[PDB]
Amino acid sequence: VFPTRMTLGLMKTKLKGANQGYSLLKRKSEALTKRFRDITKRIDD
Amino acid sequence: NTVSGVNGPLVILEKVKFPRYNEIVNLTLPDGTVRQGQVLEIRGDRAIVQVFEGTSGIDVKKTTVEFTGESLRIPVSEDMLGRIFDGSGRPIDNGPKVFAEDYLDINGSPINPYARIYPEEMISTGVSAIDTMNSIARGQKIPIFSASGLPHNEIAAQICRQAGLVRPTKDVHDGHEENFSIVFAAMGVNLETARFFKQDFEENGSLERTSLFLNLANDPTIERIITPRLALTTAEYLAYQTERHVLTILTDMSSYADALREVSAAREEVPGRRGYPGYMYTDLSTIYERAGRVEGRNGSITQIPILTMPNDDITHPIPDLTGYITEGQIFVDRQLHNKGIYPPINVLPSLSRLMKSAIGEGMTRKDHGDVSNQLYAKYAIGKDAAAMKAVVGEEALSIEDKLSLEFLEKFEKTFITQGAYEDRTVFESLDQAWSLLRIYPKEMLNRISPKILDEFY
Amino acid sequence: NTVSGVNGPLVILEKVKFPRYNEIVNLTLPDGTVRQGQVLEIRGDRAIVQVFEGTSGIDVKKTTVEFTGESLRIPVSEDMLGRIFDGSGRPIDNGPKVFAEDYLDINGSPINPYARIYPEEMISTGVSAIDTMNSIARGQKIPIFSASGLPHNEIAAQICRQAGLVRPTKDVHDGHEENFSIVFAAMGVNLETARFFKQDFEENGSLERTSLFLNLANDPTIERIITPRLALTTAEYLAYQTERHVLTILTDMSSYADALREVSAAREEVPGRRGYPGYMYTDLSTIYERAGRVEGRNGSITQIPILTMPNDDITHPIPDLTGYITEGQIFVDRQLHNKGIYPPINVLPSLSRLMKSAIGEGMTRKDHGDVSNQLYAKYAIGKDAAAMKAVVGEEALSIEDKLSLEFLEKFEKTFITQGAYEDRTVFESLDQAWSLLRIYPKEMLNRISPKILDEFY
Amino acid sequence: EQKNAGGVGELEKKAEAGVQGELAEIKKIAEKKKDDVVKILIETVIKPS
Amino acid sequence: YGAIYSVSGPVVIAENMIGCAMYELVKVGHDNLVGEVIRIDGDKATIQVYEETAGLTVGDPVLRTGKPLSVELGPGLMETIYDGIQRPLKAIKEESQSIYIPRGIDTPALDRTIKWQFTPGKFQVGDHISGGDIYGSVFENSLISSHKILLPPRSRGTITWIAPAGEYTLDEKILEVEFDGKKSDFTLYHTWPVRVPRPVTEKLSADYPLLTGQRVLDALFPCVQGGTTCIPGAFGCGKTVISQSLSKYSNSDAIIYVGCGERGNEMAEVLMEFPELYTEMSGTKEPIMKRTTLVANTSNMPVAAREASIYTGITLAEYFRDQGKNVSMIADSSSRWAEALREISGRLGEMPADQGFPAYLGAKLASFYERAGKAVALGSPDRTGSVSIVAAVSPAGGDFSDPVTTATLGITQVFWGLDKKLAQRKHFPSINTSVSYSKYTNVLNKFYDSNYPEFPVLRDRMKEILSNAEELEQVVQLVGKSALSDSDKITLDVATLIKEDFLQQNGYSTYDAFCPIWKTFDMMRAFISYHDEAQKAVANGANWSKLADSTGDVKHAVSSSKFFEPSRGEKEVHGEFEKLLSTMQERFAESTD
Amino acid sequence: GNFKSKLKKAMLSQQITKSTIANKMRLKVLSAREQSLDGIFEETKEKLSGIANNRDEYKPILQSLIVEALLKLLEPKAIVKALERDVDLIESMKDDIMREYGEKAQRAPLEEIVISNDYLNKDLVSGGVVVSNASDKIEINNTLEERLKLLSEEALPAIRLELYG
């Protein structure tokens, strides 16, 4: 149960918080695994 | 004259054009009982009445009306305490009627000699979480917002038991000097709980000091709404004529709201947003009007309305409109109740916007308003830090936030918690506030001027 | 001659059924104040009238009515321009008579000669963000969706005031052989705002290029929806008979929509979602029908309606219906206004769907289309880069992201940002674009043909 | 700024002279065609409108 | 005349109401209640009756007086509290013995015993006269004797009689005007319809800034005298404290305080507080009161009065405007007026279509607004008068998506935010640059440039610091901090300083009774200088931590600014802040190398 | 910086004079046009009085004014306000006005013409009549001045095009 009369406004911003996090965090993840791979070949040698 | 028709519980009388507005009429039914009804509206060669006893029995040609010639007014005595009444003030114990010394109007629109002096002296309800944070002043009306899934009836009860045991604490504080009296009105509340209310008055020894008006849901809707108006009027008489501090506890607003809603289903007057009347605001405001310092400025009436949110949200019509008429709000919450807390009071949306001005150092302390301000900011961060803690992990935590997480629990389980029978000194309350704050450095504080802090901390 | 009643804005006059629809009627008051109104409905021995000025204060017997015999039409003329009017098109300038050469209907269509030939040939607004990135060619109707969090009136003025100083520059390159006229319509406006538009125009010397119609917000709602209708008709006559390219600026569509929702208070007509009509489509369409290429097609009527989101909701019924009908949309966001960029048009979700169709040469260049692709794509990537920088830091960021970042700051602070009295012709804009894009090598520029890329980096 | 200390008062020399001839042709053709336009107005008003 | 057809709620319907209009003043019943015919349905008129019913019967007469319902504006408006129907509250306290209006009791609109000193105008006999021209003046208080007696809006003629200087009553005629035959005799009071916008010589664009006396309100977007403003509320965030506080701190020649539909306790507070406290205009013997004309409606009184409140209130600002007095009208809260409008909508039975709210609501809100603004005072001697409308908006259902707020933002050109989360945390009034705008800004910063300040430059940077902080905070919440740029950290830190010193202030700033522009500028100037030096300092190489540690002494000093009051430099320019700039420059020197 | 700024400022003040030249030219031209128009109309009403004051020439004109009004009235009694010399004029051709309505409408002859005791001034109108319903529910204001004013709406474009188009 969550408020019926004009929750819409808060709940929309929740979505925008979430959304921003997927893109940014995926960029961050992408970059760390790209580095990780570089290290892998170095460490092995 | 006679019934033309009945539309819903509303009864349509066809009658000749003479009656007063809000004039009591007595309907003679063929069953050995005569009943009273009040003209809700008077119109062109008909009047629509809702009859105060029962809802069935009206006939087409077997009915007779006679006009009483007098509109309903409540007959008031200050000897009305120490008596048990129903919703019409009739006795249920046989014998104690309202009786009179004066006759005063049920709306309280004629007299209205409400003082132009703003809430002054301190009032407490002996519950630390109420007293310190949203501090009660005489003549201040601040609502109790509750939700069902709660022992919300037990919270109301607790306040009724506590009211009048507070008063020697207050005498000593010098925010009371004069008699304390209770005016108690019940609307649509359970049988068990009605015995709990009588029992709480009995224990206190304030049974003599209180009046009980008892109104169930098997007593009519129109009659339900009248009940607090009778109570209210009697409180105004107590406050004005004999310069007393009157506390009227008015439960349950929600039941009162429904009753209003059931009507207008055959009135010409039309219902607005969410099927609630648009003049629902107007109805609330009539109830609320008797509240404030009386003229003589040695009496006052303080009013505590009890609202259970039937849907749980605060944007529901019943709470939303009330919060506006009042000056702040007090939030009880389901979540505290679940952990195993009593009385479970959340303080985060709870604020009273006329709190600072009323109170001063003479019956509180100057830090009373500062020490309260600090505790809201820290509690608020602790609550957001908790939500974030679940989702992301302990990655978004920072030093202040970890400290804030502990603060939340510390506050919840020591500060807000206390026994039903327990009551609390305001000065005591303030040392326990300081204690909780002692786990944070002083440089992190900023809702308190550095002068004030240095003295009491 | 006998006013029956008034029910809100809607006035019921009781007189015979011999008038026709939208025939002006005159309410003659004993106050010596003649007010005109237009019949909304005519029924048997009564008509329902909305009075343009006021709507109440008419007696029920001391009044007379007279019927004009003429349905409402605009006296239209080419000598009408350069003058300030009300919402009925009547001078407030203190100037001479309106003058006529024809009387044209303002009901929705005068002759409707909207072509079955699609848009080409550039119309320049003198704002870099709109013109290069979202090319508007005549007949197209692209709205500005702005919000109240932006200064919507000031941006609207900017488009008018800088528009038509683009034109000598166009004439030389040979885009326009015929002249340029502006029709500016202001709705439910504030007094400071009405004056502001005239002063801006006076300053540029665009005053006699345009006619300004002001309807003020104390003026009743019915006048307000009539205002753009008057404007749009005037424009269709200048465009058809004397062949001129006209840009019509209509602010505020949100106030027009409100008026439409507002009327209905004795009608048996019910609204749709959020209280806004089910027929809100129909009303929008009405403004929209006067917009497009005129017959003969060297003149045109070009429409830019301005819509203000009151609560930043793109799922709000007003923008949604409009958005479906319109050939793209311009989005203006609060965020950029906050950094202090002015105008703050984020070109991030903005689109012109007939972008290619507008450009050519002689008022554009060939290289216009390719550039539009480089700048949009690079910009989007620039926003994404800003978020990543905050996380990784400045000393741990990528080369590609670093470039994208540099572009974001310059793009915002040079292309979008322009001064209040600085005109940005399309040729001027395209040069500034090559400086920004230069920072990327040729290796990272590729949505550009190597032919172009070799000419201009 | 000296051409903006001379550019005022010069507005009215150019505003008058610029229509000096337009304002004479307006009053000229009005006196001519006056009875012949009036005579049409006379017919409409004095027979059903 | 008319015979009561039906009485439903406090609404009375009466048949046989012919040669009646739709704003008529009427006496309703045998009880002679004050009332007004809002609308008519055929012969049957629907009348809103401004005193309650409890005993008014059907078939009692209804007598139309032969004129609209108007309000009386004369002398003695100042230093007295009235209601929204405008009957003196004070006179009601003695005579009825009831503090608030009793039923069936009627009292005329102003006091009829009070005598005033009339001094002659600038007219003599046989002179042509017009409306809003000054026929005399009355020495009304001790702070102000600026109460000009005017010929009414919509009056012209020749003055047959000019009475000489002396003591008169306000019922005792002093003027005869003849227009075409006797127009009427005139007195000190004049009547004005509360349903019409008061005539004006011309409206002029706003361009003179009023200083609110609140550093924060001036800093982000300056107020103007002549303007329109929204301040969000929530009904438990100290909105009352800042309303009453603004009223004291803002300085105009006359102030009109209009309680729309209030707690009754809150109204009571202002009535008590104002003679106890002092003016900044050197007011004496009930200081503030002498400057205020007060309209008091509680929500518990009849709904008609509460409709009437705003309209009477605006007419009072407007009356004083024609005299050449600059007015601040603070109306609180406009959402309670809308709630009264929703009430009327359902009681008459008119259609609601504004989200369960009135048909008329959007237009009535605009109509009230347009009456405020800056103007050349009515009458030909030429004065400047202005009205700035500060109208509080607050929820009527949703947070900003309620009808009231949606309409108001459309029409308002100034909006100053108030966030709830910061309110509970005690950092009110909180102005958020995304939830705030001013369209008056560009003319206002150019005005302040003429006055001395560099103001426009400071505005852009103030905006930039707040603006980037909101976006960086969103990355902080989700991702966390493990890294956050050297530059980004600086912006966050400095934005905290701005919160604490400006945004937080309401009984926490020991000087706040009136704050000059120069002082605000000087304070913000130190903050912005600290910012630019700091970001340059990390880039030319120097750790973020070394930079915090060395700035040290000055950083505290800006943190503490808020308590400081003009006592050094000029009367508006403060030396501690001027000293601060130079010391800052020295800190940068230590910090870079 | 300030050279360029003060320069933009005076170049803007320069184009406000272009705007005042363009507004003052167009205001003069147009106000000379309005003055000619009010001499066309002014002459119409000096000729109309001349016709009206010669009663025998006027007699058919009065008949057709009332009859024009009756076609839009369609009530069984009509109340006629006229000038002092024209209530007598009407009286002596009562039979011809109700005859001529019955032959020129479908509706059966007007049963009565009510000759009014309220009269029109030479100060308002040049003559003409106010034909109104019996219970005074509707008025067909068919006066000479009212008619010329109404005429002006349709005649204005005809005349504007011929003279200045």
Curated annotation (Swiss-Prot), chain A:
Additional information: Present with 8500 molecules/cell in log phase SD medium.
Tell me the gene name: VMA8
State the similarity comment.
Answer: Belongs to the V-ATPase D subunit family.
Q: How does it assemble?
A: V-ATPase is a heteromultimeric enzyme composed of a peripheral catalytic V1 complex (components A to H) attached to an integral membrane V0 proton pore complex (components: a, c, c', c'', d, e, f and VOA1). Interacts with RAV1 and RAV2 components of the RAVE complex, which are essential for the stability and assembly of V-ATPase.
The protein's job, in short, is: Subunit of the V1 complex of vacuolar(H+)-ATPase (V-ATPase), a multisubunit enzyme composed of a peripheral complex (V1) that hydrolyzes ATP and a membrane integral complex (V0) that translocates protons. V-ATPase is responsible for acidifying and maintaining the pH of intracellular compartments.
The superkingdom of the source organism is Eukaryota
Question: Which start and end residues of the full protein are shown?
Answer: 8 to 52 of 256
Compartment annotation: Vacuole membrane
What protein name is recorded for this chain?
A: V-type proton ATPase subunit D
Curated annotation (Swiss-Prot), chains B, C:
Any idea which residues bear Phosphoserine here? 109
* Coiled coil location: none
Alphabetical list of Gene3D superfamilies matching this protein: 3.40.50.12240
Single Gene Ontology MF annotation? proton-transporting ATPase activity, rotational mechanism
**Protein name, as recorded:** V-type proton ATPase subunit B
Q: Which InterPro entries match?
A: ATP-synt_VA_C, ATPase_a/bsu_AS, ATPase_F1/V1/A1_a/bsu_N, ATPase_F1/V1/A1_a/bsu_nucl-bd, ATPase_V1-cplx_bsu, P-loop_NTPase, V-ATPase_su_B/beta
- What the protein does? Non-catalytic subunit of the V1 complex of vacuolar(H+)-ATPase (V-ATPase), a multisubunit enzyme composed of a peripheral complex (V1) that hydrolyzes ATP and a membrane integral complex (V0) that translocates protons. V-ATPase is responsible for acidifying and maintaining the pH of intracellular compartments.
Which species is listed as the source? Saccharomyces cerevisiae (strain ATCC 204508 / S288c) (Baker's yeast)
Q: What else is known?
A: Present with 131000 molecules/cell in log phase SD medium.
Keywords attached to this Swiss-Prot or TrEMBL record, sorted alphabetically, are: ATP-binding, Hydrogen ion transport, Ion transport, Isopeptide bond, Membrane, Nucleotide-binding, Phosphoprotein, Transport, Ubl conjugation, Vacuole
Return the PROSITE patterns for the record.
ATPASE_ALPHA_BETA
Question: Which Pfam family, just one, is annotated for this protein?
Answer: ATP-synt_VA_C
Gene name linked to the record: VMA2
What GO biological process terms are annotated to this protein in UniProt? Answer: ATP metabolic process; endosomal lumen acidification; Golgi lumen acidification; intracellular calcium ion homeostasis; pexophagy; proteasome storage granule assembly; proton transmembrane transport; transmembrane transport
Q: Which residues bind ATP?
A: 353
UniProtKB/Swiss-Prot annotation, chain D:
What GO molecular functions are on record for this protein?
ATP hydrolysis activity; proton-transporting ATPase activity, rotational mechanism
Q: Which GO terms describe its cellular component?
A: fungal-type vacuole membrane; Golgi membrane; proton-transporting V-type ATPase complex; vacuolar proton-transporting V-type ATPase complex; vacuolar proton-transporting V-type ATPase, V1 domain
Tagged with keyword Isomerase: no
Keyword Transferase assigned:
no
Give the main localization category.
Answer: membrane
User: Please, which domain of life does this record's source organism belong to?
Assistant: Eukaryota
Localization per Swiss-Prot or TrEMBL? Vacuole membrane
List, in alphabetical order, the GO biological process terms annotated in this UniProt record.
Answer: endosomal lumen acidification; Golgi lumen acidification; proton transmembrane transport; vacuolar acidification
Of which family is this protein a member?
Answer: Belongs to the V-ATPase G subunit family.
State any further remark. Present with 2280 molecules/cell in log phase SD medium.
Q: What does this protein do?
A: Subunit of the V1 complex of vacuolar(H+)-ATPase (V-ATPase), a multisubunit enzyme composed of a peripheral complex (V1) that hydrolyzes ATP and a membrane integral complex (V0) that translocates protons. V-ATPase is responsible for acidifying and maintaining the pH of intracellular compartments.
Subunit structure of this entry?
A: V-ATPase is a heteromultimeric enzyme composed of a peripheral catalytic V1 complex (components A to H) attached to an integral membrane V0 proton pore complex (components: a, c, c', c'', d, e, f and VOA1).
What is this protein identified as? V-type proton ATPase subunit G
Q: Which organism is it from?
A: Saccharomyces cerevisiae (strain ATCC 204508 / S288c)
Q: Gene name?
A: VMA10
UniProtKB/Swiss-Prot annotation, chain F:
The family line of this record is: Belongs to the V-ATPase E subunit family.
Could you identify this protein by its name? V-type proton ATPase subunit E
Any one GO MF annotation of this record:
proton-transporting ATPase activity, rotational mechanism
GO cellular component terms attached to this protein's record = fungal-type vacuole membrane; Golgi membrane; membrane raft; proton-transporting V-type ATPase complex; vacuolar proton-transporting V-type ATPase complex; vacuolar proton-transporting V-type ATPase, V1 domain
Which span of the entire protein is present here? 60 to 224 of 233
Q: Which UniProt keywords apply?
A: Acetylation, Coiled coil, Hydrogen ion transport, Ion transport, Membrane, Transport, Vacuole
Localisation per UniProt entry:
Vacuole membrane
Q: What else is known?
A: Present with 16134 molecules/cell in log phase SD medium.
Q: Please give, as recorded in its UniProt entry, the membrane topology of this protein.
A: Peripheral membrane protein
Q: What is its main location?
A: membrane
The record's note on quaternary structure and interaction partners says: Homodimer. V-ATPase is a heteromultimeric enzyme composed of a peripheral catalytic V1 complex (components A to H) attached to an integral membrane V0 proton pore complex (components: a, c, c', c'', d, e, f and VOA1). Interacts with VMA5; the interaction is direct. Interacts with VMA10; the interaction is direct. Interacts with RAV1 and RAV2 components of the RAVE complex, which are essential for the stability and assembly of V-ATPase.
An example GO BP is: proton transmembrane transport
